[PDB]
Design a protein around this ligand. Structure first.
Ligand SMILES: [Zn+2]
Ligand SMILES: [Zn+2]
Ligand SMILES: [Zn+2]
Length: 107
């Protein structure tokens, strides 16, 4: 004669609503439609107009961003190239900042 006991661990896994932006499992069909609203405008670089999942991800990018330099902080006005904006900052703001190396490149 004798006796004893035992145990075990649960587990959940089934149809889940993941985000088509960061692939994050939601809590419901509603969290998906909404999570997409914030996960779309969470982090938008005012330079290249990007869209990240978190606000930090952008903060870092802005530092290594290329459009940044092409962004007239003065009047927060971005441009297509440096030569183009330069004229806007040299003719209007008249800054005449340090222009880049000239080249035969196409314009
Ligand atoms: Zn997302
Ligand atoms: Zn950017
Ligand atoms: Zn300007």
């Amino acid at each position: 004669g004798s006796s004893g006991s035992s145990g075990a661990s649960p587990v959940e896994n089934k149809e889940v609503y993941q985000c088509r932006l960061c692939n994050a499992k939601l809590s419901s069909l509603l969290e998906q439609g909404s999570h997409e609203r914030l996960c779309r405008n969470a982090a938008v670089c005012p330079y290249c107009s990007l869209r990240f999942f978190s606000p930090e991800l952008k903060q870092e990018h802005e530092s290594k961003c290329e459009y940044k330099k092409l962004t007239c902080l003065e009047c927060m006005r971005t441009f297509k190239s440096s030569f183009s904006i330069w004229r806007h900052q040299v003719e209007v703001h008249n800054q005449n900042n340090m222009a880049p190396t000239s080249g035969p490149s196409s314009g």
